[PDB]
């Protein structure tokens, strides 16, 4: 078995079905005590929670699902009828994520799409009936943050006030993306300093609010 299978089994055997908080706590326990994994984690997760509560987004797009930790984190704070779409290139992880969400009782709020972000983003309007996004969580791969931001804009998926929230802007780091959004009059940016999940290593999130062309 894989690390990701082991995380899912741990949740299944140490959390309560239908209880998102118990799922997050189980994942965080496993990943602190047993095996590190690239979940956004509790420290940065608390910042994400504060952002989600401030904006109450009706439609969120996540890039990079992994085991479903961040999807659970966000979806448990969505209002009735609000929705999360999450894109995941690795089919084994897409299946873990789906099972994680099912266990948490969040499956009605989330659509887990198996494919590359750069291939799926251009299909959101016609295939997935999206108009514009209220929030984007970028947490897939550092080198895709800038290209996928520019693709989102090309595809007409951003509106005035769309919130981009980017993980790992310090470690592994996303220098092109940061230089771009911080230098562009089309974004208003704020940095939230924190720590790499499960580690005493500095990391941070960037919030970049789209301001129109
Ligand atoms: N181009 C791409 N499109 C979609 N998924 C991608 C991708 N490149 C990498 N990924 C996926 O992005 C994930 C990064 S880890 C995601 C962690 C998750 N957001 C959490 O905090 O719980 C991996 O599962 C990886 O397979
Ligand atoms: O590739 C990633 N995608 C999404 N999130 C990540 C993450 O949160 C990480 F900490 C890391 C990471 C991996 C190894 C390290 F030594 C440090 C950070 C990687 C990713
Ligand atoms: Cl943490
Ligand atoms: Mg990350």
Q: What is the C-alpha separation between 21 and 23, in angstroms, rounded?
A: 5
Residue 139 annotated to the active site: yes
Rounded to whole angstroms, the Cα distance separating 187 from 201 reads 28
In three-state form (DSSP H/G/I as H, E/B as E, the rest C), the secondary structure along the chain is CCHHHHHHHHHHHHCCCCCHHHHHHHHHHHHHHCCCCCCCHHHHHHHHHHHHHHHCCCEEEEECCCCCHHHHHHHCCCCCCCEEEEEECCHHHHHHHHHHHHHHCCCCCEEEEECCHHHHHHHHHHHCCCCCCCEEEECCCHHHHHHHHHHHHHCCCCCCCCEEEECCHHHHHCHHHHHHHHHCCCEEEEEEEEECCCCCCEEEEEEEEECCC
CA of 186 to the centre of ligand 2 (A): 27
Ligand nearest to the CA of 70: 1
Under a CB-based contact definition with an 8 Å cutoff, are residues 162 and 133 in contact? yes
Neighbours of 79 (CB within 10 A): 9
Which residues lie near ion ligand 3 (Cβ < 5 Å)?
41-43, 197
CA atoms within 13 A on the CB side of 3: 10
β-pairing, 163-166 vs 187-195, is: unpaired
> What is the distance in angstroms between the CA of the first residue and the CA of the last residue of the chain?
47
Domain ranges within the chain, ordered by starting residue: 1-213
| Nearest alpha-carbon partner for 15 in 111, 108, 80, 102 | 102
Experimental method of this PDB entry: X-ray
Write down the CATH number for the domain with range 1-213.
Answer: 3.40.50.150
Ligand 1 atom having least distance to the Cα of 137: 19
The verdict on whether omega for the bond into residue 172 sits within 30 degrees of 0, i.e. cis, is yes
For residue 201, the ligand closest to its alpha carbon is: 2
């Amino acid at each position: 078995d894989t690390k990701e299978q082991r995380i899912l089994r741990y949740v299944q055997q140490n959390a309560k079905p239908g209880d998102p908080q118990s799922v997050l706590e189980a994942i965080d326990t496993y990943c602190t005590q047993k095996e590190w994994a690239m979940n956004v984690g509790d420290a940065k997760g608390q910042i994400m929670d504060a952002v989600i509560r401030e904006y109450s987004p009706s439609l969120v797009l996540e890039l990079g699902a992994y085991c479903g930790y961040s999807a659970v984190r966000m979806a448990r704070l969505l209002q009735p009828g609000a929705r999360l779409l999450t894109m995941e290139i690795n089919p084994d992880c897409a299946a873990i994520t789906q099972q994680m969400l099912n266990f948490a009782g969040l499956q009605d709020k989330v659509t887990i799409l198996n494919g590359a972000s750069q291939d799926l983003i251009p299909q959101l309007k016609k295939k997935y009936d999206v108009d514009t996004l209220d929030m984007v969580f970028l947490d897939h791969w550092k080198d895709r943050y800038l290209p996928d931001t520019l693709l989102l804009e090309k595809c007409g998926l951003l509106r005035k006030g769309t919130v981009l929230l980017a993980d790992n802007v310090i470690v592994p780091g996303t220098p092109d993306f940061l230089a771009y959004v911080r230098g562009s009059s089309s974004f208003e940016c704020t940095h939230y300093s924190s720590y790499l999940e499960y580690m005493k290593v500095v990391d941070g999130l960037e919030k970049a609010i789209y301001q129109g062309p």
